[PDB]
Design a protein around this ligand. Structure first.
Ligand SMILES: CC[N+](CC)(CC)Cc1ccccc1
Ligand SMILES: [Mg+2]
Ligand SMILES: [Mg+2]
Ligand SMILES: [Mg+2]
Lengths: 352, 352
């Protein structure tokens, strides 16, 4: 019984308030990048070693690779082409784990010993991610790298904790954000926004650190919101910030939703206050990520918000009128045919 | 300036909530443990490798190791002697890194590659800490270990950031929590309260995870609260959670203090509220930690809370007397002369 209606009352405030307006790229640029990124990642995930260690249903690997290339490209609009590709590999790995089961425990028992000795991790995921990492890290200075590493690590714990579908003992007010922060790849996204070929870690240490701290919550709440739909009646997505707010904080799915919104709205207000007068170049990237990020949410299959445009394309509310007005802008700019960039299929590359 | 009355009220409330009371920890036992831990550690830090790779003025090392042994022994009341010893070494390392003013950049440049390769780290602090870690992790299961490994890493970055003496951009509301969390060592503390020889993560996963989640905030805010007296006039330490709230949030020092207190009390309440009915054995570890922690704050000279007792030992106010009650209780069990356990000095062990 997805609340609907109210969903719009939320989405609209956010979009209207952040003055949603994806302006980055040109149809003739957007595709150049979608294809470049998809091409490298797909060639990578098609190798035998990757194919044999990453346990993923071919179909899901493909859908994920596409949702990721879409995310990297639409949000990291100011980084190099190579950078998007390598980021797309790293984020495609994390998405595989985010949607998977399997118990880590058995393989994580000698984690730190194998680490300190230089011995491939028992867990296949760690074995492939740690092997690939260097191709992501080369694009960054040391500090931003630490952030990427830590975050990827935290995210690993989060997925683990998530495998107990636990929303927290009622009255464990802290639990909710504790868990969301742990699996939101906050510091990983925020730091990967600053390639060294384009930024000087030491010269912009303060702005970059501030961006990591602030963007962590914006980035995650916006997703907690936009994807409230697709994560509604799905297992594994059963445990979400909103849903755990209810359990742990003891309130109604209606209030928890208002909570997430009042927050998201504030994060947004402070992003601007803080980064407006600062280095134009920084603002530009934050700006592009924020708009591009929303464009992707209103366009990728994963979040399937189409099943809402075509479910309210009728209800003439001053609310669902704005929602649809927005959804339109989005697809208009970011709705592309996979037939123009996502090819050939990863599988087809694998059996060669 | 200085809310002597307001502080007292908040302190008594916090002590009340957590039920600050009579431990079953006998003063003769406290001394057994204080000496055991101090001894293994002093012998460790007196090793030559340690002696030449750890840059710390001998007197501060001596003092630091002592403050730590006290903190551990008085708070990890239910763990074995070896456990207290090994945690005492790891926590002394961390505390010692704040004395370092050296830029992590040059040594962090090849962090990930040396790591993945199994080559000794460039930054000496890492070389020692990572080499000693097994000595600590062996006391815990895999889950709990991951947590320690992560916090220590987050800790390293926080030190890095703190080197910039930056309290946050005005309006960057998410910065103080971000930073305090970065170097709070929360998930480390929380996860180190459950040795595998006494608990089973698999069976108590949700209880443990939840503790980590709530303890992270409790432990850091309670420390920020007790430290609020010594740091009040400390022009040296410019960036403290509260002082950052002042700058980042743009509020009066008093308003920020008001913020900490609310979070601290509320955090305390929810602690009990959530763990009273839970496994008895677990609530004991929690219940005891909170008490010794406070006992330690009340007893370690570094916080100079005795200066307060010396200024309200006669007022006939309910708060003022309640305070003294608790203090004399703590002094009763905790006030122990260093001569009784901390010997011989590390310096003397080093020449031998
Ligand atoms: C990158 C962070 N994200 C983006 C939608 C929001 C918290 C979740 C995510 C996790 C794992 C793979 C892809 C996306
Ligand atoms: Mg996830
Ligand atoms: Mg998910
Ligand atoms: Mg979500």
């Amino acid at each position: 019984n997805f609340p609907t209606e109210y969903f719009l009352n939320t989405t609209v405030r956010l979009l209207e308030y952040i003055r949603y307006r994806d302006s980055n790229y040109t149809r003739e640029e957007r595709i150049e990048n979608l294809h470049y990124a998809y091409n490298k990642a797909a060639h990578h995930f098609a190798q035998p070693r990757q194919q044999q260690l990453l346990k993923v249903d071919p179909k899901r690997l493909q859908a994920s690779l596409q949702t990721i290339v879409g995310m990297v490209v639409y949000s990291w609009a100011k980084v190099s082409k190579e950078c998007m590709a390598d980021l797309s590999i790293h984020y495609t790995y994390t998405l595989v784990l985010d949607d998977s089961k399997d118990d880590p425990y058995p393989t994580m028992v000698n984690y730190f010993d194998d680490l300190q000795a230089g011995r491939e991790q028992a867990h296949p995921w760690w074995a492939l991610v740690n092997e690939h990492f260097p191709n992501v890290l080369r694009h960054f200075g040391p500090f931003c790298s630490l952030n990427l590493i830590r975050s990827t690590l935290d995210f690993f714990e989060g997925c683990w904790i998530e495998q107990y579908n636990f929303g927290g003992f009622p009255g464990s007010h802290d639990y909710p954000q504790f868990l969301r922060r742990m699996n939101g790849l906050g510091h990983c996204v925020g730091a990967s926004l600053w390639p060294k070929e384009q930024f000087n870690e030491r010269s912009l240490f303060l702005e970059i650190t501030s961006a990591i701290a602030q963007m962590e919550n914006w980035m995650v709440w916006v997703n907690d919101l936009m994807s409230f739909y697709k994560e509604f009646d799905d297992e594994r997505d059963q445990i979400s910030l909103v849903k755990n707010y209810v359990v742990s904080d003891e309130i109604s799915l209606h209030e928890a939703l208002e909570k997430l919104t009042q927050d998201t709205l504030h994060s947004s207000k402070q992003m601007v206050a803080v980064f407006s007068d600062k280095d134009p170049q920084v603002m530009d990237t934050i700006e592009c990520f924020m708009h591009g990020y929303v464009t992707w949410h209103l366009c990728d299959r994963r979040y399937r918000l189409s099943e809402i445009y075509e479910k309210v394309k009728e209800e003439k509310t001053e609310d669902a009128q704005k929602f649809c007005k927005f959804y339109e802008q989005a697809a208009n700019v970011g709705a592309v045919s996979p037939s123009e960039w996502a090819y050939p299929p990863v599988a087809q590359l694998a059996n060669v």
